[PDB]
From a paper:
We could purify the isolated S. cerevisiae Hop1 CBR (residues 322–537) but could not identify crystallization conditions. After screening the equivalent domain from several budding yeast Hop1 proteins, we determined a 1.5 Å-resolution crystal structure of the Hop1 CBR from Vanderwaltozyma polyspora (residues 317–535; 34% identical to S. cerevisiae Hop1 in this region) using single-wavelength anomalous diffraction methods (SAD) with the two natively bound zinc atoms (“Methods”). The V. polyspora Hop1 CBR structure reveals a compact assembly with a PHD domain (residues 319–374) and a variant winged helix–turn–helix (wHTH) domain (residues 375–439) with a C-terminal extension that we term HTH-C (residues 440–524). The N-terminal PHD domain coordinates two zinc ions through seven conserved cysteine residues and one conserved histidine residue. The wHTH and HTH-C domains fold together, with the HTH-C region forming an elaborated β-sheet wing on the wHTH domain and a long C-terminal ɑ-helix stretching across both the PHD and wHTH domains. This lack of conservation casts doubt on whether the Hop1 PHD domain could bind a histone tail equivalently to other PHD domain proteins. Moreover, a comparison of the Hop1 CBR structure with those of DNA-bound wHTH domains reveals that in Hop1, the canonical wHTH DNA-binding surface is partially occluded by the PHD and HTH-C domains (not shown). Thus, if the Hop1 CBR directly binds nucleosome-rich chromatin as suggested by prior studies, it likely does so in a manner unlike canonical PHD or wHTH domain proteins. The overall structure of the nucleosome-bound S. cerevisiae Hop1 CBR in our cryo-EM map closely matches our crystal structure of the V. polyspora Hop1 CBR (overall Cɑ r.m.s.d. of 1.06 Å), with the most significant difference being that a disordered loop in the HTH-C domain of the V. polyspora Hop1 CBR is well-ordered and interacting with DNA in the nucleosome-bound S. cerevisiae Hop1 CBR.
In S. cerevisiae, the HORMAD protein Hop1 mediates the enrichment of axis proteins at nucleosome-rich islands through a central chromatin-binding region (CBR). Here, we use cryoelectron microscopy to show that the Hop1 CBR directly recognizes bent nucleosomal DNA through a composite interface in its PHD and winged helix–turn–helix domains. The Hop1 CBR comprises tightly associated PHD and winged helix–turn–helix (wHTH) domains and directly recognizes the bent DNA on nucleosomes. In S. cerevisiae, the HORMAD ortholog Hop1 contributes to axial element integrity and acts in the very early stages of meiotic recombination by mediating the recruitment of the DSB-forming endonuclease Spo11 and its accessory proteins.
Residue numbers in the entry: 319 to 440, 460 to 524
Amino acid sequence: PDIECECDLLCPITSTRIKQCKNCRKFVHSLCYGNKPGPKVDKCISCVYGPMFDPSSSEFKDLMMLRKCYRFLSRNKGFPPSIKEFTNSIMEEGQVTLENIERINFCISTLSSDGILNFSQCGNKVSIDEEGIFVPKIGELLKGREYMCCFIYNSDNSHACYLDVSPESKRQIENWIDQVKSIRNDF
Ligand SMILES: [Zn+2]
Ligand SMILES: [Zn+2]
């Protein structure tokens, strides 16, 4: 199938299912659609927003990566054995660029700030094979070291933009994007 998920990235077939929009019949990633069970989404993000939607923006790409990262971690019941193993689960190795390395590091840092990922010195043990991730208390996860990482599904500091399962309205989607703009501002 031709995948037309709004993230506009390949996703490894072992990391996600494919779902179909009932309204426009296109295929999307289950990771980007809340891991919602089953084969369908009643209306995809584009169909809910309507034709004026612009998925090309940096902030919308940040949003979809956050959603994808959270839902992969939820499906995996925690963090993979290393940063690069996580990266190569979220994306196809061959498609990885500096822009999306930065974006994935932003997602990891954000989920750590939000209390979804909780890193500590030595959950799952995680090898740091990429520099540039900052987390509370520890600060920078040092390349070449290992840390323990505890994943929890929700926290009082989480953001709804990655916890919400499905798109429900144009205003909801706009608020998702506003949330990520705010996170970047504070980042
Ligand atoms: Zn996607
Ligand atoms: Zn659709």
